[PDB]
């Protein structure tokens, strides 16, 4: 049925910039797959009871597999070759059998994407506890209901660098495992049903990026020990229900990426602005009433997204900070725009869509890095500008 020409014309690229074959809705693998020796990945989608021959040894460029609902078997020399060649895996298991036990036999694995539907009997998975065989595993993305963190995660405490869970509405418990992370740098607990910050997350000592998206955090209180995460620069806490940020965030002086958008914060604190190192501050779609005038300390802030908030009064202290490059105040509750905006030499983004304005001042021509495509304004207010001011951002 399948000629090598058909597989050559089937060839395309994946989301990881690799040459991937998207074999979808088939009975098995063709033997003409291995004639394309330049292949770097195969996407097997719903191809069950597949037996991989040893001819996979011809796939010297192969470094990735993506198994989507495939109960695939492999042969011994093919197993050895993929043990000595493969780096990336991504297996989805709608059914338990679709997750193969052979895939843990490799040792050159770096990145794993364990999407699927895991049963709640997680500690019984000896197939999981075989990730200790992998001596280079650094990325582990489990898109499944991980109620209790496996001791498989314990066995890969050091070599792991990226840890991702999409728990999908299940509470993440048995915190001692995440306490046992030593050299983990990126913790991505997306929707782990965390009613607050776990003590396990806070027992991390080498974290660099923490994401608690869609986790209903109640407070950020234990921060007296975030000072030990001097390696941390990225705090991802948006799409949450946090209502306040206390002074305790002053403990981390290496924080650069801060996410607090779509939150329940009704008034932005000034002690949050007391920190000056923060370069990325995201607070879009929040309930913020006003900005305290202590934001002038935040000079290094290159991203202050306050767009789609409830903010009615914007102080002039924010316009003193000239390093703010990406500024979005669209769909806010402002009335007039500050004339003093020309000191922002580095200002590429300005978004003011939806917000009520009376007259656009000529001082919008004072911005130097502003662009017409970067200045997202309605056509009606595009008309309400001087022709020279129009050309100031329109002509490149």
């Amino acid at each position: 049925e399948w000629t090598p020409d058909k597989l050559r014309q089937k060839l395309q690229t994946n989301a990881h910039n690799r040459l991937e074959l998207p074999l979808i809705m088939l009975s098995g693998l063709p033997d003409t797959v291995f004639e394309i020796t330049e292949l770097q990945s195969l996407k097997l989608e719903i191809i069950k009871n597949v037996m991989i021959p040893a001819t996979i040894a011809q796939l010297d460029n192969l470094q990735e597999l993506c198994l989507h609902q495939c109960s695939v078997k492999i042969h011994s020399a093919a197993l050895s070759f993929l043990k000595e060649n493969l780096k990336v895996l991504s297996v989805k298991f709608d059914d338990m059998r679709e997750l193969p036990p052979w895939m843990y036999g490799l040792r050159n694995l770096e990145e794993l994407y364990l999407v699927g539907s895991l049963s709640h009997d997680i500690s019984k998975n000896v197939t999981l506890e075989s990730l200790r065989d992998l001596k280079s595993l650094k990325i582990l993305s489990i898109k499944s209901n991980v109620s209790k963190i496996p001791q498989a995660v314990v066995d890969v405490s050091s070599h792991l660098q990226k840890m991702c869970v999409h728990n999908d509405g299940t509470k993440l418990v048995m915190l001692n495992n995440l306490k046992k992370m030593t050299n983990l740098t990126e913790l991505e607990l997306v929707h782990c049903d965390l009613e607050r910050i776990p003590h396990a997350v806070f027992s991390l000592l080498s974290l660099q990026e923490l994401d608690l998206k869609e986790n209903n955090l109640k407070s950020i209180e234990e921060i007296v020990s975030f000072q030990h995460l001097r390696k941390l620069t990225v705090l991802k806490l948006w799409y949450n229900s946090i209502a306040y940020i206390p002074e305790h965030i002053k403990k981390l002086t290496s924080l650069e990426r801060l996410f607090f958008s779509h939150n329940k914060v009704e008034v932005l604190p000034s002690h949050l602005f007391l920190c000056n190192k923060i370069r990325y501050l995201d607070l879009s779609y929040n309930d913020i009433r006003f900005i305290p005038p202590e934001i002038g300390v935040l000079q290094s802030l290159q991203y202050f997204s306050i767009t789609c908030n409830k903010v009615e009064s914007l102080p002039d202290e924010l316009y003193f900070c000239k390093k703010l490059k990406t500024l979005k105040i669209g769909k806010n509750s402002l009335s007039v725009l500050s004339p003093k905006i020309g000191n922002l030499l580095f200002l590429s983004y300005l978004d003011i869509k939806g917000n009520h304005f009376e007259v656009l001042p000529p001082e919008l021509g004072d911005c130097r890095a502003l662009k017409r495509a970067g200045l997202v304004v309605e056509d009606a207010l595009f008309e309400t500008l001087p022709s020279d001011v129009r050309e100031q951002m329109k002509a490149d």
């Binding site: 000629t3 690229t13 990881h16 910039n17 590429s348 983004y349 662009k371 495509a373 997202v376």
Partner: protein, 393 residues
């Protein structure tokens, strides 16, 4: 067979006959066909109906023991110009290929070296007169004396031994008309002096020769015509400064090597156009790249370059900036000054966000701008509309 017709890399009409009992006469009834591909055809005879195949110029013989009719033999003698022969046994090669006179391109892939058949079977290529391209993927232990006899008129010598070293013995001195030499997978471990004795070469490829050291290139100024020094897929860990003497290089393919630092003397050559240093150990890019104004496709894919200097954007002729799989923290806005950029690769990097000025390039489109979707979302929806329109319009 009309719907079976395809086109090759040389834009010629093509027809691949794979695993047939013989060869159809309706294939031979075709007139628009240019390259017919005979693969795994067991013991067929060529009918004289090849007189209909006037546009036929490339006969591709893959494991095909072909017997030949005399009028078809004369027609192929006066028409056929490119023959590729792959065989598993030295008896599989047809003996009428020597009678061909209009043949210039020959691709003898498969072991010519055998006991008492080591280049004695192809001793009949002395009958070949206009042969200019002689590809030999044949595991040759030593280069034949027959090509030393033939190479007066030979213009390209692509030898693939797949892991067997050539004892060249400076025998290319009698072979003076080469413009291209592609020694690929020869495991030479050093550059021989036969390339140095030659003078007419303009494209030198030494792919996968396990070249640990390339210090000989100081003498390459003797080769006044070289324009493509493809020193890729080797074990090259450094570049000697005498490459600065090589001002005539236009494409310097050093990718998949172990080079960790570029000396600035390499950056003296103003004629470099394709500086591919991908899959290497480079940690920084020198600013003198702004001097290389003729550079078009700078591929530093999968390197250790953390920050692009602004002087990189001094060269306005960058057409394809392959920055993928690197550790680029942020791409400076000076890329908005570039106009010739058609495809930039940023997926797989440490890129925090895509700057707005990236949309300033006119010829860039979504197919050209390959990047992660969330990184694409960082551009303004009006700038994103411009780029999505470049995808559409």
């Amino acid at each position: 067979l009309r719907q079976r017709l395809t086109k090759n890399a040389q834009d010629k009409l093509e027809l691949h006959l794979f695993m047939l009992s013989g060869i159809p006469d309706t294939v031979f009834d075709l007139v628009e066909l240019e390259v017919l591909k005979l693969e795994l055809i067991p013991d067929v005879t060529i009918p004289p109906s090849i007189a209909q195949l006037t546009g036929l110029k490339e006969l591709w013989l893959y494991h095909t023991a072909a017997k030949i009719e005399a009028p078809a033999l004369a027609f192929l003698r006066e028409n056929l110009r490119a023959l590729h022969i792959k065989f598993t046994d030295i008896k599989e090669i047809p003996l009428w290929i020597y009678s061909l006179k209009t043949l210039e391109e020959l691709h003898l892939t498969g072991n010519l070296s055998a006991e008492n058949n080591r280049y004695i079977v192809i001793d009949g290529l002395r009958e070949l007169k206009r042969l200019k391209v002689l590809r030999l993927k044949s595991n040759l232990s030593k280069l034949p004396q027959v090509v030393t006899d033939v190479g007066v008129h030979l213009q390209k010598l692509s030898i693939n031994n797949e892991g067997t070293k050539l004892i060249v013995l400076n025998s290319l001195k009698k072979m003076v008309n080469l413009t291209e030499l592609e020694l690929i997978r020869c495991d030479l471990e050093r550059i021989p002096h036969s390339i140095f004795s030659l003078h007419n070469l303009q494209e030198i490829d030494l792919k996968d020769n396990n070249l640990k050291t390339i210090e000989e290139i100081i003498s390459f100024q003797h080769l006044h015509r070289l324009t493509c020094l493809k020193l890729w897929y080797n074990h090259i860990a450094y570049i000697p400064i005498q490459i600065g003497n090589l001002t005539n290089l236009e494409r310097l393919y050093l990718n998949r090597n172990k080079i960790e630092k570029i000396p600035t003397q390499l950056f003296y050559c103003r004629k470099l156009r394709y500086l591919d240093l991908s899959h290497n150990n480079l940690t920084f890019l020198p600013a003198d790249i702004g001097l290389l104004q003729n550079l078009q496709n700078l591929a530093v894919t999968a390197n250790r370059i953390e920050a692009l200097p602004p002087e990189l954007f001094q060269c306005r002729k960058l057409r394809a900036l392959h920055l993928g799989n690197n550790v680029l923290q942020s791409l400076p806005s000076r890329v908005g000054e570039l106009t010739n950029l058609t495809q930039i690769e940023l997926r797989g990097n440490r890129l925090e966000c895509l700057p707005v000025e990236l949309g300033e390039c006119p010829l860039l489109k979504r197919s050209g701008l390959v990047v992660e979707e969330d990184l694409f979302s960082t551009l303004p929806p009006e700038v994103k509309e411009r780029l999505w329109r470049a995808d559409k319009e």
